[PDB]
Subunit: 61 residues, 3 copies
Amino acid sequence: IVQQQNNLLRAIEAQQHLLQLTVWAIKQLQARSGGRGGWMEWDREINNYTSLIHSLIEESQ
Amino acid sequence: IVQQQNNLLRAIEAQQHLLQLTVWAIKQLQARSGGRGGWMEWDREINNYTSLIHSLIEESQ
Amino acid sequence: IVQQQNNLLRAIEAQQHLLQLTVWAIKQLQARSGGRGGWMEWDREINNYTSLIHSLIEESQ
């Protein structure tokens, strides 16, 4: 069970890396059309959910 | 162990929020070029996988 | 506990499917502007993190 939870955690940490890579790409795509001022709130939500996850990951470890 | 599974669940729920935010952004980006008729199947898969996850999250709780 | 870890795993597997769908869409969006030569490294990271996750998923099962 313990080892199993360890694996699940690593899976989640790796997926978070994937998530951040897609976020970075999306921003690049957005930046193409012009300024990202209209994505301020979107950015705020992404940042906030990312913080929650970092907290949870740190807590799980 | 119990508390640990609780954390893993919250991590997964937060990541799902991130996932849906990237999906929403992607759709906005697509909508820029024009109609999203060509993404009907893509949308169907996204919706279906999202349902599975909602079911699993509800079940885990 | 055991059944709970099983659910968490399925949740993670479903989210990975979602992740790969967003990656595929992002690539399509990128391909619109032209060649994706500038995304070689981005692609390498996505592929590498996806491999880690596949390994972890296989190991968890």
